[model samples]
Target: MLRREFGPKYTAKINEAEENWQARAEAIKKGKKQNTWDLFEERGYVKDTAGTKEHIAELMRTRRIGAYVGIDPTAPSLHVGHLLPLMPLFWMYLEGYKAFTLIGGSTAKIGDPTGSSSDATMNMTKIHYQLKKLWENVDTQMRARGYEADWARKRGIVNNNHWWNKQPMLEVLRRVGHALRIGPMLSRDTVKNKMTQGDGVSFAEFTYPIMQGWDWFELFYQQGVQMQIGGSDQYGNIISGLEVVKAARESEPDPQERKYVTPKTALDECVGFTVPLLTDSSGAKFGKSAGNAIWLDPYQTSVFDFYGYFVRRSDQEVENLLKLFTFMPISEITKTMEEHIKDPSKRVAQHTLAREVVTLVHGKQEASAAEDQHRMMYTGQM
Candidate 1:
């Protein structure tokens, strides 16, 4: 849940693993768990117009739930930053619900406008080639990682191009443009970021959110996806989707004129969630640190580098990251965390997190080798 800024100012201080030394030891002996998120109920959350975990959880507990993680294919590989929202979708998959991976081939041509001064330099032909290759790699990696492709495999890979390819410039505007006003778009932080330092944003960049939201509308109407997950920075774009959905639902047909009008009760709840933005002990954001990201592509970052990254984390950051990225049994995870605090030099929690993540993204063999490498690096005789 990467937030645009810092974390929500929560009241309940995180009970550090060492706070209740005796209790932590005793709990581990009793096979109890204590994930940092076990305190989320205490810490509370920050909600926006889209709703909160309290609301989303209620809906999940009551209704049929589906989640979509939209990936704009601007690059050949997904970096760790991309995993923020993906963790939720993966969790949903583990919970036995439909999860969708939406490739933004159509929207990719017009890169999303967030914290940018100008419209993205889009090479359509390059993006097309890269998008195809990336999906092939993504599906292969996901299937290898433990996702059941039997279900995902049958569903044809989805792309916004299916809708965009047929749209004419004018019809797109009248149908969508008529609904959006300049004042509201200008108010968005994304637009604000662009306009604050520069002359202003381009017309295409201003309309990017409009087109992006339409993709969600397509999924809602056609594929039954009710939820979208993104970085917290995407709140503006997510709201744009909600507005489109709200307006579409409100529309009704007039019998005489054969035209539609807003429905009195057309407000269907379209919602989204964001992953917390991650930072290191030095308070630097994860990817942008030292001018390089922890890349998801194995080639860009070796399994050894991946393992080392987690191992070097502070105990506090490690605990939070485990909750954000991994989904192991809480009891086992707590035992690991408590044991590590007792032997901070041993780094039990860090190793566990790294192993679990490597196993998930790579495989058991890679995970084991990564762990082995870590040992060898330190001992030189492992």
Candidate 2:
């Protein structure tokens, strides 16, 4: 089930073990003090930030930017919807900021109010297995763009289960719960919908923000995580967490009198980055294909069709799709569009998006192979 899906291009094995990769990363981080956020803004990935834009500027000055992105292990592999959130973390790690991918091992069992509309069924064996492979897929893809460097060391992975599994229920209920207000919790769109317009939510689902809020608190206090990155749906949860951290700091001895923690408010210390949703031309959220999911795992979704999805994007969407998805230079992207418009029938833009994205997830070899196999199917030649 854990078949290696990434090719040498997307894997750290590229360019002969990254001997030059380390120096390359070192030089990049050195030359650029404003490297990470500028890239995020340029790539159209920085949709929103929890803290003020001024707070972002504050951290940029210190270069102590550590961020974590929470993810679900709903599947053994990731999907295209996962990519938008992944990009911010990708660039953060590339720019030498401490980046973490936190797997919701415990929360997967509790179920989130924003997802599924049903209770989660936990299978720890499957959950554990999924997190392992899930991190590999994401970590490798992020590093795929890298020639080498200490990718694994900089690319952190944690399970909320690490803290949630051990902490007593009473401790969480008292510490995380007391700091949160019901009005704000109820004000969330997910909770509001379930209560007013739809079926009621389970208490377990209601407690999701508390659990996740504690996650941010613990990450900030224990691991020095300064920011959380998540999907737009998690905006409330992000703020809830933000409040928890802020409240905890306030309840402590005054900032200057602090004994163990950093002497900064959550306002200056912690931030949340929310990525936009991925949807089709019709605005149906991206991630389904014929009642099945389109997974990064080629076995789950064939590499040929995986490439085909991008190859078939509408002409109108391909330009922005390229802007959002690929790491191609802006000038090159503009050049691609000019050439593509000169000959729309040739599908130049579509093919460029297809190859680059496929190369990202599956590797250059697999992308090329998929293209070759696809051409043969049409032209009847190998």
Candidate 3:
């Protein structure tokens, strides 16, 4: 049912496109000196940053910075849409930075106002259940996918509610609330868009950014986390956290100095890094709502089904997916694609992409079984 025809001209076009992509990547490579920065940069992981590349690179040189990515417990399982942000955290973990994944229980109750035209509809009861189920599913996938066990044991799967709900209203207002101005909150694109569309913004939604900012500050104070990774749409909310961390840290009285001592150095060092949204050829998001989402949880989406999904990606999409989803070396990826273009109908590149992802999420035995299943389905043989 699936077939593609690539004549000599089309083959030549693909070759030219691959060549241009590699050349551009190489050109960008000349500008960076560090391997860790280059690894993130070359993979297109570091998009918009609250701090400069030089600053982030300098902090990273210390190798003591802690990084985290938070996932709101809106769903019982994480979809493929969540992978773009998670990939960077995984990369950071491999780089030996302290890595954490936050389950945004507190913020989930408030609902992220970003990208939402209407107020959140999920009830608190469902949110609680979703949070419980989400962690179980996430823990399974992370371990099965070969993330370092000791790090998983050392760094916890934290819940924002554990700390956020404990803070007294007066203290939050006095410490964090004073630092934020009403003008900037109103100026955030999400809030601005909602207001312009005549969608009534809720009081909770208005204050959601503060809770997020507090989450970052708390993590910094408690766990020494210095970085937050999130989607590009979260740029405003992420910046709010950076502002709060700097403000809160400066406002606190130094026990030794017996004064409100402001340490200028490393005060503004916390960084917010965002990843670009993953979109299909038509530019629709990769999600269940978008009708193309694949889940990491096998219970929701089977391994063979997951394998086929990547296996079916259009040739145009596989290159980007390979870079984003797979841990395969770029050299291997380039070589695979170059060879793949020779016989487009064979789908060599898609198979490799599918295998890498499947193996990552489901381990080698599962990936092999899925491949065998795919072959059996195609050939009608046991």
Candidate 4:
């Protein structure tokens, strides 16, 4: 029987409703769901965690705190590279923790410490339009993978311009500028390389971290978002924001901030999580630098091409590719890989990865059609 010879070796189901402290802790104990901290690390979404696992686990059990992931609105579309950092936000959301998506409307105007030194000024109208489209794509992708988008319990989206535009020049100088020391500013990896380049980095570029730090300070102080996640390249920026958060807490004029504050340790309290840099282990790139960005926007990157990207990943890389990109359970993945090692030519692992990722990013129907076309084109559907 075909069913006896070729069928599932294992299955793992995720309970989407497993949110909040008690339920998630219980679920993790029963092996039904991964602990949020463990999930980030194991799935290759974590490069360096500022907080130790003991502290993260302790605090996770204590209360449902919040975290955020931010995106710069430089482009109208989110490419495949963007999804890696965003996974932590979705994991936090699923665990019944508060997670927000911030759009860097103000920061997008200024380039980073090393490069992307602005094609100079862009029209605000076009920038704002990019902001809206980017947000919609982000929200749609999350919702496609089963994010709850209710009004009362929103996985909220924020634009930095909301507060950045309102802040007086002197106040920023006093608050954020005063909090950050110039010594550390020049020490960032990018800044050091730029300084070495002889042309000299601009004052705006030098101060980019502080501007980012201010964003974290505002969210951490006002809204109680504790952790920020970004690509591993953003480790410096992530720490910049964390330092601002600590300084802002110490010098707050109002004691009213006490209620929202938790008694987290120096190590555990306002921290940053950075995901792995998006490069295949063997070194073929997946980002804009490689000119091989697979856009999440269907219009920009068709569903078929998106499927092809994962299906074509080399055997050496397919293991982590599935872990990083899919919502599949680890138990199922482990079993699938065992089968694939017996016959890599079958390409079962890559096929599973392509379909699941397409299902996650696009939809099941789109993934199904992609699979259908793949089978018809290459195989007789036998």
- Taken over the whole model, the C-alpha lDDT of each candidate is 0.61, 0.69, 0.70, 0.69
User: Model 1 — which ten-residue stretch has the worst lDDT?
Assistant: 10-19
Task: Output the number of the TM-score-best candidate.
Answer: 4
lDDT of 4 by residue, 77-190 (tens): 677787778777766765567777777778877766553334312433444444455445445555665666432233666777778888786776765567778788677777
Which pairs clash inside model 3? Answer: none
Give the Å error, residue 168, model 2. Answer: 1.6
The residue pairs found clashing in candidate 4 are 20-96
By lDDT, the best candidate is: 3
TM-score of each: 0.74, 0.79, 0.78, 0.80
List model 3 lDDT by residue over 1-382, tens digit each.
0113469986776466446434434544575333455677888887788888877766665434578888787655666677788777766665445777787877887778856312222433343444345435445556554655432222456778788768788877887677889898898779988878867689999988788888887887766688898876888888888888777776775554213223446633688789887667776776443354577678778888888877777898888888888766689899999999999888889888888777766767888988887766373211
Worst 10 residues of 3 by lDDT: 116-125
Q: Candidate 2 has which clashing residue pairs, if any?
A: none
Question: What's the lDDT for residue 360 in model 2?
Answer: 74
* Cα-based lDDT at residue 272, candidate 3: 77
Candidate 3 or 4, higher lDDT? 3
